[PDB]
Every structure is written in C-alpha cells, then in structure tokens.
From a paper:
VAR2CSA encoded by a subfamily of var genes from Plasmodium falciparum (P. falciparum) named as var2csa, plays a vital role in the cytoadherence of infected erythrocytes to the placenta. In this study, the VAR2CSA ectodomain from P. falciparum strain 3D7 (~306 kDa, containing six Duffy-binding-like (DBL) domains, N-terminal sequence (NTS), and multiple inter-domains (IDs))8 was recombinantly expressed and purified using the Sf9 insect cell secretory system. In line with the previously proposed model, our structures showed that the core region is well-defined and covers NTS, DBL1X, DBL2X, ID2a, ID2b, DBL3X, ID3, and DBL4ε.
Intriguingly, a highly basic pocket formed by DBL2X, DBL1X, NTS, and DBL4ɛ has been identified to accommodate a dodecasaccharide with six sulfated disaccharide repeats from CSA, which fitted well into the density map. Moreover, 16 residues were identified to be responsible for the direct interaction with 10/12 monosaccharides, except for the 6th and 11th units of CSA dodecasaccharide. Among them, there are nine, four, and three residues derived from DBL2X, DBL4ɛ, and NTS, respectively. Furthermore, the nine residues of DBL2X were shown to interact directly with 7/10 monosaccharide units and thus may account for the major contribution to CSA binding. Owing to its high resolution and potential high stability in the core center, DBL4ɛ was used as an immobilized reference for the structural alignment between the VAR2CSA-CSA and VAR2CSA ectodomain. Interestingly, a significant conformational change in the core region was observed. Firstly, the DBL1X moves closer to DBL4ɛ at more than 3.2 Å (ranging from 3.2 Å to 4.4 Å) for multi-helixes to facilitate NTS interaction with CSA and close the pocket. Secondly, there was a 1.8 Å outward bend for the key CSA binding helix of DBL2X in the deep pocket. Lastly, the rest of DBL2X moved about 2 Å inward to shrink the pocket.
Residue numbers in the entry: 23 to 38, 43 to 53, 61 to 68, 71 to 78, 101 to 171, 177 to 192, 194 to 198, 204 to 245, ...
Write the structure that this text describes.
C-alpha cells in the first residue's frame, strides 16, 4: 500500500522531533553533508551526497530517519546551489534545483549511472523488514518509495530559495503564452545529464559572448577554446550514448488571470483598487502600433524612460476630473501618489506581496533586463531603485517620499485608511444627529446603522467577504509571524553607520525593518497603525487603536467596534449608571436556592446518585458553589484591601455586590442546614474549618504551637465557631478601606534612656542628637528617636522602672504620647534655635567591612575578623528573623548549610529541590503566579561575585560568566536528581526533567535579559547591580537592557550556560551508579544545543501551571476513584483543597491573559512583548498546546481534558458526605483536642 512507503521525519522523536513539522525548511548518520559552485567541473555528477556516503545503517529508526537523512542531503545541496549558481535568471536556478532533485531520485532508486549503493541497498533491505515484498536489490521497492515521498523532498529542496522564484513552488509561473511542478526525474538520467550539460555550456557561451563583445587582441581565443571542447564532447553522441470597473479589495490568492495576493500572503492583506489599477510597463498602450512598447530595451535610459512615463500616466489616472472643487483634494492625492510610488518601487525592486495577470511576467522581464544591463557586477535592483527613484517620483507628482517600508505595512495602512474613511462617514451621524447626554428614537437607529456597518458579515464595502474583525485577525497573524521571523534571525542588526528610522545606518531589509520595529516597541499592527495614522481620521470620537473593545465575545480594537468609543452606553441612551461604568471585579450572581453561579459554570446535575444522608442534587451543587465562592471572595477581599474617586466609587459598588451576595449565601446555607439536619455544621463551623485547613494545606500539606497557634486564633474563630463574624469583620474592613483612603536581642541604646528620675523625655532627644551629630540632620537621626518613641510608649535590669511606674498607676497614656510628640517637636525647635534597626546597623557595618577588605597585604587578618564577626552575629540573627517572619507568617550571609562553610566563607551551595513549594504571587514587577521551579533557582554564588566587583567591570564580563556556568550546572544536576526520582526507571521522568531544566535555563536567561518578572531578593539585587555593570549613566532602556541582551546573545554565553546545564545532567547520569541504573548515555532531549527562542515568562508559567494542574488532577482523580472510610476522605479533601487555589490562579492568570493577549510593549502594562500570543481566551490558547505528548523540547504539558478547565474548576456526589464527615472530624479535633 502507498501509505506504507510515505514517511514523515517529524514522527521520529529524536535522532542520534517536533521541529520537522511545518519547519522542515531548516533541518542516525551523524556525519554532516559537506562537499560546490555550478558548472565548475566543466574542465554534472559531483554533488552533496556525503551524508549518505557514510550511512551507518545500524543506528536507524525505520524509514523515517532515512527520509530525514535524504531531506538533509537535499536541503544542504539546495541551499548550496541557490547561492552558487550564477545566472541572474531564477528560471535557471529553478532548473538546477529540479535537476538536483532528479539526481536524488536517481541516487535513491539505484539508477545512478556512475560505498553509496551498498548502504542504500542495506537500508532498503531493512525497510523491507518493516507489506513484506508486495511493492534485484529491491529496485521496485526503491521506485515505489520514491514515488511515495517524491513531493516531500521537492518542497524541502526548494525551501530556502528566494521568495521570488520562476518555476519553483516559491513562484511557479504557468507560462501559458500542491504538487511537484516539474515531473522531470522520470526522464532517463542520461538525457537529464545531456540537457544539464548543454544548458551549462550554452549559458557559458552566452557569458563568453557578453564578456567578449563582438563589437584589441584574442578576439576569438575563447571562441576557439569553446569550439574545441564542443568537438571534444562528441562522446555524448557516438561514444557514451552507445555505451548504454471600480475595483474592490481582493484579499484572495492569485487564481491565474485574476488579480489578488501571492501565496504565503493570500488572505493576509487586501489589494487597494489603486494598487490593482496601477499603470505598468506592459499595460502601457501608447500608440495603435505596439512596436514602441514592444521589441526590447537596450540600456538603463530606456528602462528609466518606461518607468517615468508609466509613473506619469499613473499620476494622471490618480487625480479626480474636477477634484470636487479642490477643497477636499489636497493631502489625499499626495498620499495616494506616495503609495503608488512605493508600489512602483517594491515591484521594480522585486519584493512585492501582491500578484496580478501582468505582475509575474514583468517581474521576470525586469530580472532579465537587470541581468543583461548590469552584467559586470538582487542588490543591483534595489540599488538601481534607490538611485533612480527620484526621477519617477517627480514624474508622478506632475500628474522624494520616504517609502523604505515593507509592502505588507503599506497595504495595511491603506486598507485601514479606507476602513476609517467609511467609519468616519458612518460615525458622523451619531456624533451630531445623536448625542450622549431624539432621546431614544434617533440615537437608536443612528447607532444601529453603525452596528450594521461594523458587524457586517460581508465586510461592508472594504474587505471582500469576511467581517472587518475576521480580516483584522489575518492582519495580526501575519504581523506577528513577521515579528517572530525578525526575532529568530541574528544577521539583521543595524549596519555600521561609521531610534529614528535611518536608511542604511538602521539596517535595510524587511527583517531589518521589523527588528527596528521590535526595538522601538511596535510588535503589533495596532500600535504600528497608532503611529503611522494621522490624528482624527476615524471620527470626532477619540477611539485609539491600542485600546480594545468587546454568544461569542470578540475582543477587537476600538475602531472595529459595534459602537463609538464612549457612545457604547448612549447607543440606546441607557442610564449612565455607575454599575455599567464599574464594569471597566466579582464573577458570581422559600424552598429555593438563590444560587450565585460563576459566569459560565451553572448548576451541575449530579448523575452518580446513591444512598444519601438527605443530600439532594441541588444541595450538593449549592455546597460546591458555596465552597468555591467563599474560597474566592475571602481571598479577593484581602487582595483588594491593598481618578481615585472613580476607583473608590467602583470599589464601594464592589463591596455592595459582595455584601448582597453574602446575604444570598447566608440564607442559602441556612436552607441547606435545615434540609440536612431536620431529617451537619453551619456557616459558623464551615468558614472556621475553611480557614483552619489553610494552615493545614500550605505548611502541613495533608493532615497530622506558640507563635502560630495564637496566629490561628487571631486569624479565624477566636477559640470557637464564629464563621459569621470571621467574614463580616473583613467585609467591614474592606468596606471602610477606600473611604478612609479618600478621607486622607536588644539594641544597646535600649540600655540607657531618660529614666534618671528612677524635660521628661526631652533630654534624651538632645543627647541622641549630640551622639548622632559627632537638611540640618545627620544620616538616620529620625530613626533613632523613632525607636526611642517606640521603647518609651511600650514602657508606659529595666524591670524595676516599669514595675514602679505601674505601681504609680490607657487613654491617659495616649494623651501623654500626644503631648510628648508635641514636646519633642518643641525640643527640635529649641535645638534648631542654638544651631529593623539591627538590620540597618549590620548592613552599614558590613559596608564598612567591605570597604576595609577592598582597601587591601595582611588581607587574611581583616577577612578572618570579618568571618568571626559574621559567626558572632549569627547567634543574634538566629533569634531575629523568626520573630519577624514566624510571628507574622538576606539569606546568603547566614546560610547554615555545611557546604557553605566548606566552599564559601565570604558572607556550589545548591541542594535537593524540596517539592513542598506552591504557586504564589510575590516579588513580581500584576496577577501572575511564580512557579516553584523559578522560586528554587540557584543564585547563591552570583551574590559574592557581584559584591566583589564593586567599582570593578573588568571581571563583570569574566568572573560572572564563570559563576553563571557553575550555577547552571548545579541547577541542572539538582533538577535531574529530583525529576528522575519523581518516576524512578521511567522514560517520562527524564522528559519532564528536560522540560524543567529548559524552563530554568529560560528563567536564568531572562534574569539577564530585559526585566525578570520576579524580583526575588536574590535576583532583585542581582539586576540592581548588573544594570549598573553595563551602564554609563545615560539611559535605562538602550544603554542597559539592549547592552545586556547583546552580552547574553553575542559574546564569547547562552550556549555556555546551556552547555553547563548539559554538563550538570551528565554528572547526574554518571552519579546514577548508586541508582544501579543504566548510565549508557544522556537522554537526547538535552542533545540539542540550540533549543530555540524564549516565549514570555507569563506564557511559560502558564504552560508549567497547566502541566502541573493536569498531572496532579490525574493523580488525585485516580486516587479518589480508586478509593471511591478514611481512605477516600483524604483523597476527596485533597482534590478540593488543591482545586480551589488552582481555580483562583486560573482566574487571575486568565484575567492577565485577557489584558495581554495581543498587546505589546507600547500597550501592555509591562515593557514585555506578547505579540506572539494570538488566542482570545487562555482555554483556547492551551487547547492547541497542552493536548499532545510531551517531547521535552517544545511541548511542556499534556492533559486528558482540555476544553473544560473552567468547568473542571467548579465541577462526585458522595465526596460531599465524606467531606462533611472530614469537616466534623477536624472540628472535633481543632475545637476540643487543641483548645487551651
């Protein structure tokens, strides 16, 4: 069967993967194919076949690897024949490529006339081992296998060729004047060699007659030389032979005679009618006798004359008859002339994206003309335009301008200008005839006509068949593809001129231009249009292109909206109530349940109904919804307790919404308790547990004293069941928050104070100023008197005075404190007339110690004293950090690891990656959660390196790189030592290990690239110092971030760090002898050195979140299914207590995605580009990513259920009864067995 011969190298996971799918353009036998110009051996048989020459058939995975090897030996010859075939006529480069393809056919099928054949024979023999002898050395097997994979190898040999070709898929002209267009390989190879030879020798004869023109000596030496070889090649005959109409926007592909787009640009941008109606050289009918415009042209002057006269006729065709009285006519005619000039320029240059009946013909004609004119020199055509664009432009303006812009962008600008012309024409009635503040009868239809124009499925009178919205999607798709191609490329940086768009200084190609657009921050078409488009072209309404608008919700830019920006609430003149304004937040909504349903997830009918403890379908659904509601709202209140009048108004409406939602839920739970207990706990005992389990779900992870048990009493319950007042108190606090906002080890000095009696506290502030004095104040004077205030107010060997003052005797103390503040201010004035703290002291002392160390010659003395000082202060900090981190619930300087004391006595060091960490949003600089892998990155050894390089940059690019290598190696080693453990002796273990190591490497790269989203106290200081390392104190955007990116990308470092990662995992593999496991080789998922670009951190964290969520969901679901008495209560409680935080994280990251889904540097709140993200909803994004199997390089997540994350986050029946039994048990525990 044919399907038993067709192969796809994208199938083979790895070689000796998911990269040869749609990206075969750049692709067992480890030997590279190397062996070059065309026609050089005339003094064709020798070709790039070296890869197959050393074919090691032993290490081969079916025929797919063989096809990959053939694809490699075809690509490495196509890319080596495209750039080494001198003809200046792509119709012959095409021929060379097709003849190489035909020679690959012959090599594979064994028909090659001239060690290769043995390897191919054995390969086909082992393929036959895989339909056994149903398709001699397997001649017919070879023929059938070729005829099965004939198309793939052709589209791989034709890749990399210039987007403008003549007979190759990248520009197959029909020449009538998805398949292989040549079908040449079926010709016998002797005939193909004879044709190749005659083409070569006669193109060389043409080159000879050009260089040696017919019109002083040796006027026929080369002619007789060529004739001598023409007689000497007689063996081809008697020797070797015997041995054997107002146009509309097309938007569609070029279907033969009709106009439209060229392929790879079809349905990407529409052709303006002017673009299609452009007068051209061929369309230039001058006189009835066509001879003048026919025949051919001789010199550059004739070509320039044709282009000048065509431009003049275009300008004549581009001016209106009466110009409508020349009032409107003005800048519009000049703009149209500019676009025509640009189109002329890009079609002379040959980088046009539109096609036509005559465009393909004239482009080949221009290639031929430019070849025959500039014989003694692609770049010639662009230079000729850049030199001769002045004359044609001035001819155009008689019927230059900066037009070094990609034709895609100009087409986008013209299409959007037309769209805004129509928009303004149909928005103006709304602006004047209607009004925001005829009240309901005129504005209604004046906005409904606008809606009919906008949501028109036929795309009004601009786009030809799809809605403006759908066509804008095709715009964003193509623009983001351009941006991605510009990002991946490396040879596209600005040219040496010895940011304003420059001609040559700023690099000069499409890729160079898009790299410049990335540099200035325009990575999305909306921002680019907000730049190029002039102000007020879409209406008297200020609807920006960067601000977007909304059973399907479409999120599209403001101009492509159903209603004008601002009139969205005056379309029907609806009440401008603060309610709909506050939407610019919550997500919820008598023997009935007033169910507060999450928008989308409604009531879920339980199907598995068995013997129940009076728990009905509706009761279980309500309990599920209540648990979700009081896990989400109880968190939103604390997350929202932390133009402002509008914010407080919206916030008051928000707290009212939560108040009446809770009022609904109170009655709902009362009904639930009644219907449960009449024939169970209450809100007082549920919300209590719902808080307590937090401490059990965060630091205890599953179930089973002094500074935490009291914290739990003060957090919720107050030693009893008071769930009602736990939540009401925080409701009141949140309610008053914005109203109040709008209303707007002991230190030594504690030893001695102003208690001389045992100027009351006034002599202390004088002696303290005297001590600190040895803006009219020394450094940190206010802090000392502040702590003196704290000590004095806490007061009202030391115990005697507090006891005596207590025997003397708190609003009186408050009055004293106020009078004391007044007296201290008076004391400050009197002094002017005559004219934690331990951390601060330790930091200033350590800075002094660093100065002392750098001031050195007896360096061991000061370093030893520094080390013993740290050792002495360790006891003080041991009792210091806990009391301000355990009571409330830097690290390297007092890291207690032994290996720290071994390697690093200067206050690697990595260790096993504990799996106890969870997802938290801390140190981000909103709504993004840090994965534990990022939280556990090693940066310990980067800290002393940074400290040592104070006021030193010589070692900044030298020592820090070595530290980067060391830390990356240790990170990879420890990740592998913990992820291979996850599944001992399993393939998927090392796959997930590779995924995590790649993620860690990407996060390490982004610590040194742009702004690491996470500002962890290690990376915070690291970036705070290495933005000054690469700084000259000029700027903070181009001086620092661009230089840092150039350091990471172009320096003798990305590859070094990845090689450190590989070396770490190799060390892990070699140290797996105690695991008694095969340490033969390292998994080839780390084999790849170049691993691809890094997508933005939020997207990678989204992928990691999806992977972890789906793996833990499968684990917990299987646990709870296998167990469904203590065996199943644990599974159910674990599932719910893991699902609710994941639902909150899902909602937060979904909101963040919704506000960054297609934004950019100029649009998103952070200066990070998210243009490559292209899906409307996070579910839609993960549906096409987290579906297949993990490969370890590109895919980092696999999931069983993909399109119901929103429903899975809220929901299977008996789980409620076991959860209530668990609640009652944990209650009889925490309320009686721990009470005190």
């Amino acid at each position: 069967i044919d399907q038993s011969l067709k192969a796809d190298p994208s199938e083979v996971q790895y070689y000796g993967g998911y990269y040869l799918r749609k990206n075969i353009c750049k692709i067992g036998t480890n030997d590279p194919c190397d062996r070059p110009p065309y026609g050089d051996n005339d003094q064709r048989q020798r070709m790039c076949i070296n890869n197959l020459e050393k074919l090691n058939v032993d290490k081969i995975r079916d025929k797919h690897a063989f096809l990959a090897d053939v694809l490699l030996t075809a690509r490495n010859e196509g890319e080596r024949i495209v750039q080494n075939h001198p003809d200046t006529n792509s119709s012959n480069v095409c021929n060379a490529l097709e003849r190489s393809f035909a020679d690959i056919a012959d090599i594979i099928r064994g028909t090659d006339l001239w060690n290769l054949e043995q390897n191919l024979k054995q390969m086909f023999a082992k393929i036959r081992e895989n339909k056994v002898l149903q398709d001699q050395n397997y001649r017919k097997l070879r023929e059938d296998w070729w005829n099965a994979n004939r198309q793939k190898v052709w589209e791989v040999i034709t890749c990399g060729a210039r987007s403008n070709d003549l007979l190759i898929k990248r520009g197959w002209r029909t020449s009538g004047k998805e398949k292989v267009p040549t079908k040449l390989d079926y010709v016998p190879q002797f005939l193909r060699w004879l044709t190749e030879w005659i083409e070569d020798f006669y193109r060389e004869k043409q080159n000879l007659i050009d260089d040696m023109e017919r019109h002083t000596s040796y006027c026929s030496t080369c002619k007789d030389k060529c004739k001598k070889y023409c007689e000497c090649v007689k063996k081809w005959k008697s020797e070797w032979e015997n041995q054997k109409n107002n146009k509309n926007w097309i938007w569609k592909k070029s279907s033969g005679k009709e106009g439209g787009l060229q392929k790879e640009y079809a349905n990407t941008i529409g052709l303006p009618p002017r673009t299609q109606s452009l007068c051209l050289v061929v369309c230039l009918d001058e006189k009835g006798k066509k001879t003048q415009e026919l025949k051919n042209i001789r010199t550059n002057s004739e070509l320039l004359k044709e282009w000048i006269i065509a431009a003049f006729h275009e300008g004549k065709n581009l001016k209106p008859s009466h110009e409508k009285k020349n009032d409107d006519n003005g800048k519009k005619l000049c703009k149209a002339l500019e676009y025509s000039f640009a189109d002329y320029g890009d079609l002379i240059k040959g980088t046009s994206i539109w096609d036509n009946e005559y465009t393909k013909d004239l482009e080949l004609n221009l290639q031929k003309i430019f070849g025959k004119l500039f014989r003694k020199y692609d770049e010639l055509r662009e230079s000729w335009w850049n030199t001769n664009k002045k004359y044609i432009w001035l001819a155009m303006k008689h019927g230059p301008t900066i037009d070094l812009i990609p034709q895609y962008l100009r087409f986008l600008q013209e299409w959007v200008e037309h769209f805004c012309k129509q928009r303004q024409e149909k928005v103006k009635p709304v602006i004047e005839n209607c009004k925001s503040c005829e009240c309901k009868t005129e504005c209604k239809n004046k906005c409904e006509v606008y809606k009919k124009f906008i949501e028109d499925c036929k795309g009004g009178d601009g786009t030809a068949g799809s809605s403006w919205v759908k066509r804008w999607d095709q715009i964003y798709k193509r623009y983001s593809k351009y941006i991605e191609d510009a990002k991946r490329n490396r040879k596209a940086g600005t040219k040496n001129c010895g940011n304003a768009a420059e001609n040559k200084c700023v690099q000069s190609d499409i890729d160079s231009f898009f790299k410049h657009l990335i540099d200035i921050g325009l990575t999305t078409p909306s921002s680019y249009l907000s730049i190029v488009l002039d102000d007020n072209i879409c209406g008297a309404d200020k609807a920006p292109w960067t601000t977007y608008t909304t059973a399907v919700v479409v999120n599209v830019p403001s101009p492509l909206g159903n209603t004008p920006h601002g009139y969205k609430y005056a379309c029907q003149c609806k009440i401008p109530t603060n309610e709909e304004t506050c939407d610019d937040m919550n997500q919820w909504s008598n023997d009935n349940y007033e169910l507060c349903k999450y928008n989308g997830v409604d009531v879920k009918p339980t199907t598995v109904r068995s013997n129940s403890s009076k728990l009905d379908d509706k009761d279980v659904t309500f309990f599920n919804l209540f648990e979700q509601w009081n896990k989400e709202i109880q968190y939103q209140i604390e997350q929202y307790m932390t133009n402002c009048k509008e914010k407080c108004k919206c916030y008051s409406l928000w707290i009212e919404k939560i108040n009446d939602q809770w009022d609904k839920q109170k009655d709902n739970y009362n009904k639930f308790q009644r219907k449960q207990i009449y024939d169970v706990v209450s809100l007082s005992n549920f919300l209590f547990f719902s808080c307590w389990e937090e401490y059990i779900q965060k630091y205890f992870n599953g179930d089973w004293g002094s500074d935490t048990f009291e914290f739990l009493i003060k957090k919720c319950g107050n030693d009893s069941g008071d769930g009602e007042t736990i939540f009401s108190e925080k409701l009141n606090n949140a309610e008053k928050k914005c109203k109040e906002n709008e209303s707007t080890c002991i230190p030594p000095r504690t030893q001695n104070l102003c208690v001389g009696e045992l100027n009351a506290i006034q002599k202390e502030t004088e002696l303290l100023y005297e001590y600190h004095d040895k803006n009219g104040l020394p450094k940190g004077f206010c802090h000392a008197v502040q702590r003196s205030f704290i000590d004095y107010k806490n007061m009202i060997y030391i115990g005697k005075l507090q006891e005596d003052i207590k025997k003397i005797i708190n609003a009186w103390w408050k009055g004293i404190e106020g009078e004391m503040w007044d007296a201290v201010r008076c004391a400050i004035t009197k002094i002017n007339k005559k004219q934690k703290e331990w951390s601060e002291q330790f930091c200033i002392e350590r800075l002094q110690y660093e100065k002392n160390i750098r001031d050195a010659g007896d360096c061991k003395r000061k370093c030893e004293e520094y080390k013993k000082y740290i050792s002495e202060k360790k006891q003080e900090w041991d009792k210091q950090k806990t009391k301000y981190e355990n009571k409330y619930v830097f690290d390297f300087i007092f890291n207690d690891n032994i290996e720290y004391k071994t390697y690093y006595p200067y206050g690697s060091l990595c260790h096993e990656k504990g799996n106890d960490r969870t997802w938290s949003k801390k140190y981000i600089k909103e709504g993004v959660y840090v994965p534990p892998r990022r939280q556990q990155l090693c940066l310990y050894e980067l800290f002393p390196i940074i400290i040592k390089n104070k006021n030193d940059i010589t070692n900044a690019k030298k020592e820090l790189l070595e530290t980067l290598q060391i830390v990356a190696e240790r990170e990879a080693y420890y990740l592998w030592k913990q992820y291979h453990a996850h599944n001992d002796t399993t393939y998927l273990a090392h796959k997930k290990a590779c995924c995590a190591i790649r993620g860690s490497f990407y996060d390490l790269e982004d610590i040194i690239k742009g702004n690491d989203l996470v500002h962890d106290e290690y990376t915070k200081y690291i970036d705070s110092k290495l933005n000054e390392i690469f700084d000259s104190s000029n700027k903070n955007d181009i001086e620092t971030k661009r230089a840092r990116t150039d350091w990471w990308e172009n320096e003798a470092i990305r590859q070094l760090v990845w090689d450190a990662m590989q070396s770490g995992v190799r060390k892990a593999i070699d140290e797996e002898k105690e695991k008694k496991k095969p340490n033969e080789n390292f998994p080839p998922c780390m084999g790849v050195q170049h691993i691809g670009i890094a997508k933005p951190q939020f997207i990678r964290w989204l992928e990691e979140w999806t992977n972890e969520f789906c793996e833990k969901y499968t684990k917990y679901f299987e646990d709870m299914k296998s167990n469904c008495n203590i065996e199943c209560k644990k599974a159910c409680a674990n599932y719910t207590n893991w699902l609710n935080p994941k639902r909150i994280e899902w909602n937060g990251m979904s909101n963040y995605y919704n506000k960054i889904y297609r934004k950019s540097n100029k649009e998103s709140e952070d200066g990070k580009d998210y243009s490559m993200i292209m899906e409307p909803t996070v579910i839609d994004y993960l549906n096409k990513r987290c579906n297949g199997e993990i490969n370890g390089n590109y895919i980092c997540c696999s999931c069983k259920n993909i399109g119901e994350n929103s429903t899975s986050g809220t929901v299977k029946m008996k789980c409620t009864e076991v959860y209530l039994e668990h609640v009652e048990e944990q209650l009889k525990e925490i309320d009686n067995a721990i009470k005190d």
